[PDB]
């Protein structure tokens, strides 16, 4: 009855890869339960600002509680060369793959996703966290069609309501003008990002897609150009998109220090949302992901699921240079 380690898991598939991490499907042998497992090589995160950043992701994971629309953390452990986050396995695909197939979503569908994402973001903000990386491929669908925000590597944590931070930060298409103007910023930047994502879901293109007809020109467009709402969108959609995409983060829907989230809930576009049923996952999703074969691996990129299910052998030369002391106390098991 020692604490969990690597030997406690079967490795089942490779499901993902980002800048700094490899993601596997795993099974905890003891309990026969399935999780995703995010694997980070210590040699990537052994410096100054790395340690802090690994800690942030770890803390956001914990706060991500068992909130229904955030990816939760089962456990952490380490080996010599690696850190491991055992996390919820979420297998419905993501909203990028979704948009690429559906092309353009009905307003009702985009309302459902937006409402669930709003609940996730608000819960984060209420916990002192700025997400900072809201974009289509960071919004996963679970097997039933509910959303889950993922990838907390860009987050800011520990923030008091109405305190601000200043790291220039994010994915260009989604970056909020405040950030581009060099200003100190709060939770406002997430609500801007929601606006862009909503525009993407209902229009099936970016509001900034004139760029290409100069990623620094993208930035100029975001700062300087008035967004045009497609004629096909309802008046209520134009209104919510316009309010979310206010360049002035003080006037922006969702951004009032006191009433921000209540302003979102009370917006005419969200009129038919029962936010209590939504939060309890009592609203039936508009689209049910197809789960093929054993684990639904078909919703993941074949680039990853094709890989050999293994952890790359290390070279002991690099590994021995790691100061192991700075990962003391990494181990964690959820308190449920």
1 belongs to a structural domain: yes
Q: Choosing from 133, 142, 151, 190, which is the catalytic residue?
A: 133
**Contacts for 253-260: CB closer than 8 Å, 24+ residues apart:** 253/191, 253/195, 254/118, 254/187, 254/188, 254/191, 254/194, 255/187, 255/188, 255/191, 257/161, 257/162, 260/187, 260/191
Range of the structural domain that residue 326 is part of: 1-93+291-331
The strand order across the sheet containing 332-333 reads: 9-17, 21-28, 33-41, 82-87, 73-78, 332-333
Å resolution of this model?
A: 2.0
168 and 263 co-located in one domain: yes
Residues belonging to the binding site are 15-23, 38
Q: Tokens 């790691």, residue? A: 322
Instruction: Report the domain count for the chain.
Output: 2
Q: What is the dihedral of CA 210, 216, 222, 223, to 10 degrees?
A: -140
Q: From the annotation, which residues make up the binding site for ATP?
A: 15-23, 38
Same domain assignment for residues 255 and 147: yes
> What is the CATH number for 324?
3.30.200.20
> Do 11 and 56 have their domain in common?
yes
Judge whether 269 and 111 are in contact, CB under 8 Å. yes
Cα(40)–Cα(23) distance, rounded to whole angstroms? 9
Pairing of strands 82-87, 33-41: antiparallel
Nearest in space to 74 (alpha carbons), one of 19, 121, 34, 20:
34
**Scanning the structure block, which residue is given the tokens 């293994």?**
310
263 falls within a domain: yes
126 and 207 within one domain? yes
Count Cβ neighbours within 10 Å for each residue of 243-264 and write b for 16 or more, e otherwise: bbbbbebeebbbbeeeebbeeb
User: For residue 336, is it within any domain?
Assistant: no
| In a shared domain, residues 202 and 275 | yes
- Looking at the domain assignment, is residue 166 inside a domain? yes
**Residue 37: is it exposed, middle or buried by C-beta count within 10 angstroms (0-12/13-18/19+)?**
buried
Residue 158 shares a structural domain with residue 113: yes
Give the position of tokens 């694997």. 39
- Confirm whether 2 is a catalytic residue: no
Q: What is the dihedral of CA 194, 88, 58, 30, to 10 degrees?
A: 180
Q: What is the DSSP letter of 156?
A: B
Q: Is the domain of 306 the same as that of 275?
A: no
- CA 310 to chain centroid: 26
Structural domain contains residue 84? yes
Q: Does 21 reside within a domain?
A: yes
In terms of phi and psi (left: phi > 0; alpha: psi -120 to 50; beta: otherwise), the region of 292 is: beta
Nearest to 79 by CA among 46, 53, 40, 44: 40
| Residues 1, 8: Cα–Cα separation, whole Å | 11
Whether residues 275 and 170 fall in one domain: yes
Hey, is 121 helix, strand or coil?
Answer: helix
Nearest to 242 by CA among 269, 221, 266, 218: 269
- 161 and 285 in a single domain? The answer is yes
Collapsing DSSP to helix, strand or coil, 78 comes out as strand
**124: CATH:** 1.10.510.10
Both 44 and 123 in a single domain? no
In a domain, 110, yes or no: yes
Among 206, 126, 140, residue whose Cα is nearest residue 171: 206
- Kind and range of the H or E element at 38? strand 33-41
Q: Of all helices (H) and strands (E), which one includes residue 122?
A: helix 107-126
Phi/psi at 88 (5° precision): -55, 135
**286 and 313 part of one domain:** no
Is the residue at 248 inside a domain? Answer: yes
Show me where the chain is broken: residue before each gap, C-N > 2.5 A: 213
Structural contact between residues 330 and 83, judged by C-beta atoms closer than 8 angstroms: yes
How far, in Å, are 15, 164, 230, 245 from residue 302 at the CA level?
Answer: 9, 40, 34, 35
User: 148 and 29 in one domain?
Assistant: no
């Amino acid at each position: 009855m020692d604490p969990l380690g690597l030997q406690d898991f079967d490795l089942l598939r490779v499901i993902g890869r980002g800048s700094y991490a490899k993601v596997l499907l795993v099974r905890l042998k003891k309990t026969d339960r399935i999780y995703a497992m995010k694997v980070v090589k210590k040699e990537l995160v052994n410096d100054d600002e790395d340690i802090d950043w690994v800690q942030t992701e770890k803390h956001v994971f914990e706060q991500a509680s068992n909130h229904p629309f955030l990816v939760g953390l089962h456990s952490c452990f380490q080996t010599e060369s690696r850190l491991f986050f055992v996390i919820e396995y979420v297998n419905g695909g993501d909203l990028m793959f979704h948009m690429q197939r559906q092309r353009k979503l009905p307003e009702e569908h985009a309302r459902f996703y937006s409402a669930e994402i709003s609940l996730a973001l608000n819960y984060l903000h209420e916990r002192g966290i700025i997400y900072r990386d809201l974009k289509l491929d960071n919004v996963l669908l679970d097997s039933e069609g509910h959303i889950k925000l993922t990838d907390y590597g860009m987050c800011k944590e520990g923030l008091r309501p109405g305190d601000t931070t200043s790291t220039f930060c994010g994915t260009p298409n989604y970056i909020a003008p405040e950030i581009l103007r060099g200003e100190d910023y709060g939770f406002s930047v997430d609500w801007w990002a929601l606006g862009v994502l909503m525009f993407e879901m209902m229009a099936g293109r970016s509001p900034f897609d004139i760029v290409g007809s100069t990623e620094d020109y993208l930035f100029q467009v975001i700062l300087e150009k008035q967004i045009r709402i497609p004629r096909s969108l309802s008046v209520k959609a134009a209104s919510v998109l316009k309010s979310f995409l206010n360049k002035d983060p003080k006037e922006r829907l969702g951004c009032h220090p006191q009433t921000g989230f209540a302003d979102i809930q009370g917006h005419p576009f969200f009129r038919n949302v029962d936010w209590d049923m939504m939060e309890q996952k009592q609203v039936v999703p508009p689209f049910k992901p197809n789960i093929s074969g054993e684990f639904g691996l078909d919703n993941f990129d074949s680039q990853f699921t094709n890989e050999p299910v293994q952890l790359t052998p290390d070279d002991d030369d690099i590994v021995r240079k790691i100061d192991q002391s700075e990962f003391e106390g990494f181990e964690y098991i959820n308190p449920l």
